[PDB]
Design a protein around this ligand. Structure first.
Ligand SMILES: [Ca+2]
Length: 223
């Protein structure tokens, strides 16, 4: 997260770190057994780390649980990043409490101008490179579809939205990938892609979670 703030320990209780020897992506806990992340975060051997603040120090609220199964969206295209969403099932159910909690799925899509909270352990410099140990946060609005498409001609599908600041300086970044965009208590976005980070006229692009709720629910129901 570039241009954000220190969230505070366990103030984003649905935020997970995906670990394969090291943090490599964020994710969001959506029930005791399932995490939503980006398909471009797929790899084998994932340990889901819940309850984290400093990802380099055991502070007392962590739950480390290996993934049993990952399911990349059937239609994910890694060249365009269309349908950049994946589900991860935990080998055992997380213990839910105020510091480890699921985030609700949307019942409705969010509109341009909606304020959201974006969070993660990604780079805090554009590029520029500095990786934080504690969780970082950014409040940012959803941008209009037309400004999103104008920023990234030919690249924005119906499964993506832009959020952030066209002036630059405030964005998600590498290592935030897969993490949440939460708006009014609902998971509306997944950190997906962008041109660099925090660059003028290149806002963050996010997977549009409301399009996927039916797939998420039916996948959980049968797995
Ligand atoms: Ca920790």
């Amino acid at each position: 997260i570039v241009g954000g703030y220190t969230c505070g320990a366990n103030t984003v209780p649905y935020q997970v770190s995906l670990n394969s020897g090291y943090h490599f992506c964020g994710g969001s806990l959506i029930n005791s057994q399932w995490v939503v992340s980006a398909a471009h975060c797929y790899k084998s051997g994932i340990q889901v780390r819940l309850g984290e603040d400093n990802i380099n120090v055991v502070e007392g609220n962590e739950q480390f649980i290996s993934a049993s199964k990952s399911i990349v969206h059937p239609s994910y295209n890694s060249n365009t990043l269309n349908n950049d969403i994946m589900l991860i099932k935990l080998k055992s159910a997380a213990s839910l409490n105020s510091r480890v909690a699921s985030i609700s799925l949307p019942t409705s899509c969010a509109s341009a101008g909606t304020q959201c909270l974006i969070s993660g352990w990604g780079n805090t410099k554009s590029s520029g490179t500095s990786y934080p140990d504690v969780l970082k946060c950014l409040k940012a609005p959803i941008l209009s579809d037309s400004s999103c498409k104008s920023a990234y001609p030919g690249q924005i599908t119906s499964n993506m939205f832009c959020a952030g600041y066209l002036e630059g300086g405030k964005d998600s970044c590498q290592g935030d990938s897969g993490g949440p965009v939460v708006c009014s208590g609902k998971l509306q976005g997944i950190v997906s892609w962008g041109s660099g980070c925090a660059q003028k006229n290149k806002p963050g692009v996010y997977t549009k979670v409301c399009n996927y709720v039916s797939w998420i629910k039916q996948t959980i129901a049968s797995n």
